[PDB]
């Protein structure tokens, strides 16, 4: 996916170089780097300069965010937030010839990131949905009132989605409660025999570690390590439980050669001991699991080492989750956003075929 569909070419969603550089409206949905190609080059900037009437639309929390980077503060002006689950009406002007098109778009949560959102477009061409990066569990699509018309999916012509684990071997993937719960109770199982045992969460520069992160704070009343929080300076039910102090036992700092660190006993930010008693250190890397069709689910946590594990966690719904979406939805054509890194197009798109109409 280049940022273009096929039957509302004038709009670009999560790509902003190359020939989206000519968009009528931009879209994003939500503050991941690989959506974020191009949005704010140079040539993207001065062709702002020159085309007053183009804007970003994005969630109220997508605005948000990347509105407290400096380097996207020139969008401030050209950004509209458009409220979740709120039919919205936008215009799009040709620069240059003055034609005029109508859209209505619709935000939908996506569950994969603080601001993530579905992108529902309906208009004279057809009705679309570009799902943006998405986990919804089974039956979470069934309950989106805005995907439906008189009891029934819409008629939608074209998906574009998200099929980053979208190959049956990825069938099944402990859902984001289970995941929860394992890291929540390995974590209170160390953190709970004294003071000194310490957590090191080793996480991505990415958001969407915020939903553990609020919700270990929140059952242990331990703020969470944090390289950068001003991000948050306006969303208090994430900002309070984070923190800069090193002086916590649940650590999710960052340091460019950390694992490193943690082989000699020491956390990214450096904090070795307390009193002089040396901290009692696990690290614990949320990951990716997945179990097979004919498989049973097997531990969210894996143990590594004596002091190290991994954990259940995934941005991404699994393969059976996407079949399930996707069958649910019936489209007409249904366009794959990304090869998964072990397959093919064909491949993809033939998986998806029997679920389409056409
Ligand atoms: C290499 O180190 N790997 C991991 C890890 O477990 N990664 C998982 C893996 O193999 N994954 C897959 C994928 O298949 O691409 C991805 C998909 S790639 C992607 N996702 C987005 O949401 C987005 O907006 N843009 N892009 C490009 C997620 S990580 C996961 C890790 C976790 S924590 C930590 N410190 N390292
Ligand atoms: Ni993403
Ligand atoms: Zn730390």
Redesign the pocket.
């Known amino acids: 996916f280049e940022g273009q569909m096929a039957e509302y070419p004038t709009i670009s969603i999560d790509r902003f170089d190359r020939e989206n550089l000519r968009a009528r409206a931009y879209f994003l949905s939500?503050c991941?780097?690989?959506?974020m190609k191009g949005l704010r080059a140079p040539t993207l900037k001065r062709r702002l300069e020159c085309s007053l009437k183009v804007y970003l639309y994005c969630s109220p929390v997508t605005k948000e965010l990347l509105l407290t980077s400096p380097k996207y503060r020139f969008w401030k002006k050209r950004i509209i937030s458009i409220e979740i689950e709120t039919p919205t009406q936008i215009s799009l002007v040709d620069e240059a010839s003055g034609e005029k098109e109508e859209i209505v778009v619709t935000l939908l949560p996506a569950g994969?990131?603080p601001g993530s959102v579905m992108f529902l477009f309906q208009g004279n061409n057809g009705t679309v949905l570009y799902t943006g990066?998405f986990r919804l569990a089974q039956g979470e699509a069934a309950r989106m009132e805005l995907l439906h018309s008189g009891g029934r999916v819409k008629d939608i012509q074209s998906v574009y989605l998200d099929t980053?684990?979208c190959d049956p071997r990825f069938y099944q993937i402990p859902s984001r409660e289970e995941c929860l719960s394992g890291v929540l109770e390995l974590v209170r199982s160390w953190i709970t025999r004294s003071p000194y045992h310490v957590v090191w969460l080793?996480?991505?520069a990415?958001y969407?570690y915020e939903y553990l992160f609020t919700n270990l704070s929140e059952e242990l009343g331990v703020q969470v390590h944090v390289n950068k929080l001003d991000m948050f300076r306006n969303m208090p039910e994430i900002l309070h439980h984070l923190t800069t102090d090193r002086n916590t036992q649940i650590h999710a700092c960052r340091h460019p050669k950390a694992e490193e660190y943690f082989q000699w006993s020491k956390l990214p930010c450096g904090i070795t001991s307390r009193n002089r008693i040396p901290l009692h250190i696990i690290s614990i890397?949320?990951?990716?699991m997945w179990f097979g069709e004919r498989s049973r689910k097997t531990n969210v946590i894996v143990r590594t080492g004596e002091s190290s594990y991994?954990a259940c966690?995934?941005?991404?719904s699994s393969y059976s989750e996407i079949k399930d979406f996707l069958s649910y939805l019936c489209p007409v054509n249904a366009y794959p956003n990304?090869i998964?890194?072990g397959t093919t197009m064909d491949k993809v798109v033939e998986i998806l075929k029997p679920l389409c109409r056409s």
Do not use: I, L
């Open positions: 939500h991941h780097k690989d959506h994969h990131c990066d980053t684990f080793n996480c991505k990415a969407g890397k949320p990951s990716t991994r966690f995934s941005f991404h990304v998964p890194v």
